[PDB]
């Protein structure tokens with residue numbers, strides 16, 4: 001049971017309980033207003049407690065996707081947009097400046113609400129802010145944040161792909177090709193996005209999907225199985241050997257490895273022309 | 278320039294090179310058709326080569342969000358939709374059944390095109406498929422895939438959070454609360470996605486966002502800095518101490534820790550009510 005304010009680019013959802021002057025709670029890391037609901041109950045007889053799901057979280061919905069620069073660590077799009085959400089939320093519920101509390105990164109949003117929309121602010125509270133920009137040692141703390149985020153975003157992935165490599169016995173050539181960075185940064189950032197997506201939304205769902213041997217036998221005359229000449233011993237060739245074992249469907253060898261169609265396009269094509277040309 | 282076919286919930290983009298019978302190439306992990314163009318160049322005098330950007334990748338775009346259950350590892354929404362795209366693409370490019378080659382996860386899409394839309398297949402080729410469902414050792418390979426993806430998705434995040442709370446001296450009760458797993462498999466998936474979004478899209482961007490001490494001093498009578506009585510020594514209280522030392526803006530102690538509003542709501546309210554009630 002949530003309220004909705006439609007705004008530029010999002011349906012902003014929020015709880016509202018009580019009577020009197022409006023009191024907006026801005027969540028921190030958890031991003032959602034439910035975490036203030038026991039606090040609201042203790043306040044609903046003095047303030048109209050409004051507790052927001054910030055537009056990227058919870059029951060709030062984006063109506064158009066984030067800009068691609070939002071992943072840049074010095075992008076200001078999201079913090080400024082959250083702060084404008086709170087100001088428009090205030091302006092839609094009150095004709096007076098309102099009370100505001102933010103906690104942790106939510107208190108940083110609160111700082112930007114006061115900076116950019118001081119006319120909506122009656123009183124404001126910053127509960128344990130982690131912003132570092134104005135500290136004498138801002139650099140130390142910014143560098144810690146950057147390096148721990150970098151570790152999280154990269155280490156486990158690198159290890160897991162190598163573990164995939166040994167477990168599946170991927171050929172060296174494929175391994176280097178399949179894990180080579182892009183010459184640009186716009187192409188390099190996309191490639192982490194894409195790999196993360198394949199991992200969460202493709203590999204498990206597709207490799208355990210609803211194909212039976214019976215499906216191949218039904219139309220056996222149509223099917224060729226292809227094994228690369230440079231990827232012998234790898235797990236997908238064993239998939240083809242098993243299909244062939246149980247169905248009789250022929251295996252054709254074709255040049256290159258798992259990526260043979262671009263490792264060796266000429267020889268790849270010569271085989272496809274022999275089969276189908 | 279690429280070609281476009283508009284389907285339910287997606288605009289599907291694809292390269293088209295050559296003439297002759299239609300030959301559809303379905304990409305695996307990289308998900309885009311460009312990887313087939315050097316091959317397409319070798320076949321263009323024999324086939325109308327069609328190299329697809331599957332709908333979640335490349336120059337294709339969704340026109341509706343993925344279903345929330347698509348992150349479920351047992352989901353078959355994506356593989357079915359991909360298979361249905363290829364069938365629709367074939368039907369839009371030929372009145373005769375066509376030639377189709379899929380590679381790796383793209384060969385799995387090709388298998389579902391055959392199962393569910395055999396009417397569009399003249400011949401089909403499965404290049405190095407990694408599907409395990411029908412293998413006699415299926416449990417082995419399914420559980421390897423599940424474990425390695427899970428490790429990739431969770432391991433470095435669990436380590437980095439632990440490093441974060443220790444660099445920042447987050448209170449034990451707070452670290453306990455902010456890492457506690459959700460109580461459902463579906464709750465944990467969203468918890469993971471939420472934390473992963475916060476790390477990539479919020480922590481660096483907000484904590485180094487453009488706020489200066491003069492932004493506070495300009496409205497000093499409006500502000501209260503709040504420190505939890507149970508999170509002493511933690512980095513955010515250090516931030517508040519600095520703001521206070523430089524601007525004289527008051528620090529008020531409020532019960533609980535970084536999550537005090539939920540940890541002790543009664544005592545948290547009593548302070549707020551002292552402040553603004």
Ligand SMILES: *[B@@](*)([O])C1=[C][C]=C(C(F)(F)F)S1
Nearest residue numbers: 028029104105130480484
């Ligand atoms: B409250 O959610 C936070 C306390 C420290 C934070 C950072 F990691 F940004 F330093 S966030």
Ligand SMILES: *[B@](*)([O])C1=[C][C]=C(C(F)(F)F)S1
Nearest residue numbers: 203207305306381382407
């Ligand atoms: B081709 O891109 C693949 C070879 C092995 C794969 C899996 F990780 F699923 F086993 S995918």
Ligand SMILES: [Mg+2]
Nearest residue numbers: 080081084116
């Ligand atoms: Mg604005």
